[PDB]
Design a protein around this ligand. Structure first.
Ligand SMILES: [Zn+2]
Ligand SMILES: [Zn+2]
Lengths: 173, 173
């Protein structure tokens, strides 16, 4: 299968991410590289990238996916809301039915290691989900400000990546 | 936190650096100044310097770090091998455990923008790592002769500096 994969957020200027026990922008890139590795072990062809500095970063992220035909376009994020010791958990966002197929599979896998918030339809008109040619999903891996979520994530990054890849490819790796 | 920073190499005579798409001695100084700015933005007390001409430049570099107590002493370098279009990447050198703490954090940050060559223990008897009072690291930011490395570096110098500062201070800036 062909997969486009992008890390959410820029590193400076407009578009930077959230921070708590972990830094979203940094971990989006660390986890991307691990997901690429696991996707390739599953036999997929992967087109990955990131945008570190640009006022046009949203369009540039979509251009990474749109440069070539792919079966699915995936963007990695981490969530935020309020600092808590409690588990908060995982959700995967889609806009339309074609992305929902993948969002449900990825969320089912991540829900075995994080609290299940479910696959979720886009309620904020996210540019990534409306400007890619391929079916698109946005993974909110876990909350940067949950101590329980991040305690698990920091010690199991390779497992998080494997589960994402297994959900995308719909198979065990 | 208190940080001592030095730019690698002299500008003439004994001790000059490498050249490729960028000039190491020049960029060590440019990037040093950016790292100082980002470290100060992160709340650190910073002592920096360089040695432009001296046959005794190694001892003089260490004296910049040793003049006052600091938590970590950092020297900036760029790597070299052969001229290539391909990525070559980043590594940070330490001698002992107390520097390894910082080297691993700096390398983890720089590996989100450059190919990851790793935090590495010194097998070459670097004077800088052996003659500093404080824990010490030597950052080989990227390769001067890699077009891919320098293409990113030249366009993102502030981001390179921010990532180094975040690795040293262990927090988001
Ligand atoms: Zn985000
Ligand atoms: Zn050097």
């Amino acid at each position: 299968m062909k997969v486009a994969l992008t890390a959410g957020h820029t590193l400076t200027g407009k578009g930077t991410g959230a921070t708590g026990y972990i830094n979203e922008g940094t971990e989006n890139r660390i986890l991307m590289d691990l997901v690429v590795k696991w996707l390739k072990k599953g036999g997929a062809t992967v087109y990955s990238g990131k945008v570190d500095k640009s006022n046009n970063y949203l369009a540039e992220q979509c251009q990474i996916a749109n440069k070539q035909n792919v079966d699915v376009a995936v963007q990695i994020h981490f969530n935020a809301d309020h600092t808590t010791l409690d588990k908060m958990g995982t959700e995967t966002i889609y806009k339309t039915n074609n992305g929902k197929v993948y969002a449900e599979r990825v969320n089912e896998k991540l829900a075995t290691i994080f609290k299940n918030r479910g696959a979720k339809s886009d309620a904020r008109g996210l540019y990534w989900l409306s400007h890619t040619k391929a079916p698109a999903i946005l993974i909110e891996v876990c909350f940067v400000d949950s101590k329980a979520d991040t305690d698990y994530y920091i010690r199991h990054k390779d497992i998080v990546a494997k589960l994402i890849a297994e959900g995308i490819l719909n198979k065990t790796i």
